[PDB]
Structure formats: structure tokens, C-alpha cells
Amino acid sequence: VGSLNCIVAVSQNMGIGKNGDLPWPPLRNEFRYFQRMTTTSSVEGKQNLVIMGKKTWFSIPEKNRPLKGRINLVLSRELKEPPQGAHFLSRSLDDALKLTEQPELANKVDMVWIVGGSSVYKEAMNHPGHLKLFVTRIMQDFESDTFFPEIDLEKYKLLPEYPGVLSDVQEEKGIKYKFEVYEKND
């Protein structure tokens, strides 16, 4: 209905995951920021939809599943029904966005958030239209097995600031990271 956005936390070597989990120790305010951005709707009586791939879903502790206050959609071609806790299942990202325009959800969803994995990001990314990427830069290297695709600076502009997103360097468990927002329209 509203805006299509991606949200990712990536290490300096572009890593987003390792053996089913994050490559760094848990960062509690990085998690807090993920939840405040995905859960806040810009219009009353609306909710945000969060789209993820099957291993992203299973990477979330079972006790926080489904993500609360959000419409949880799982992307999968192998699954027959949404996994336990999930609200929706689609076989592709267009089917997922085609569903948004179904009276079902059409008067219900403000913003649409893509939360992972790389294949989903790679795809939302080349998709046409207005897109924003919310990138948390974890400023160090971490052994990964899964990476974020390359941001094309000829298409995405790094914004100088964005309301509700801290512009300075954060630090936790001794890891420094900073929050960035990029925008596209093509």
C-alpha cells in the first residue's frame, strides 16, 4: 500500500549471517532499532507488513515468532503452508506485493519491510520503483557465510540525515556501528 523498504545490518566485509545466525554477538539496541522501524506505522489503524525468506524466519528465536504488531509473510517455494506462527506464505516477491492490493490487506498495511535474506534483498533491490534501504553498518569484519549484495551508488543516494535515525556512531559490547538510509527512484 505505502512505502517499500529494506532493513539490513551488515559487517565491513558485507556479511549478514553465519550458520543460521548473525555473525556478531547480539546488539540489543540494534534490535530495538529494527523493531521500532518495522513496527511503527505512519497512518492510524494500519500495520506494517514484513517479508522474509524461509531461513530468515527460522533464524528468529521461536519465542519472538511471529514478530509482534507486524503482518509476517514468509517467502517460499518448497513450503505448502506458512510455518507455525506465520501469517502468509508466497512463492515470490511479486506475489507478495500483488497480495497487498487484495482487499484482504489493501486497507490494512501502511509500509512494507523486507528483512532478509540475500536473495530477497537482491530482488527487492533491482525491482522498479521507489525504494529505501535502511543499512546499519557494523564497523568491523566478521566471518560470514551469507552477504548483502552490492549497493550501486549510481542508483542509490546516501541521505544526509533522516528523521528518527541517529546520525552518530553507536557502540555496544565494544562494536561500533552507524545507521544509514539510501534512497532510489527509477
| Separation CA 103–CA 159 (nearest Å) | 34
Residues 132-151 contacting ligand NDP, CB under 6 A: 146
| Separation CA 66–CA 38 (nearest Å) | 13
Q: Return the sign of the alpha-carbon dihedral for residues 50, 54, 60, 64.
A: positive
Near ligand MOT by CB under 6 A: residue from 4, 5, 7, 133? 7
| Separation CA 140–CA 177 (nearest Å) | 8
Q: Return the sign of the alpha-carbon dihedral for residues 23, 113, 57, 31.
A: positive
Torsion of CA 93, 98, 102, 104, to 10 degrees: 0
Query: Segment contacting ligand MOT (CB under 6 A): 56-64, 96-104, 119-127, 167-175?
Result: 56-64
Site string for ligand NDP, 73-112 (x = CB under 6 A): --xxxxx-----------xxx-------------------
Near ligand MOT by CB under 6 A: residue from 3, 40, 64, 126? 64
30 binds, among ligand NDP, ligand MOT, none (CB under 5 to 8 A by kind): ligand MOT
Site string for ligand NDP, 35-54 (x = CB under 6 A): -----------------xxx
Near ligand NDP by CB under 6 A: residue from 4, 5, 6, 16? 16
Ligand-binding site membership of 9 (annotated): yes
| Separation CA 77–CA 99 (nearest Å) | 16
Catalytic residue numbers read 22, 30
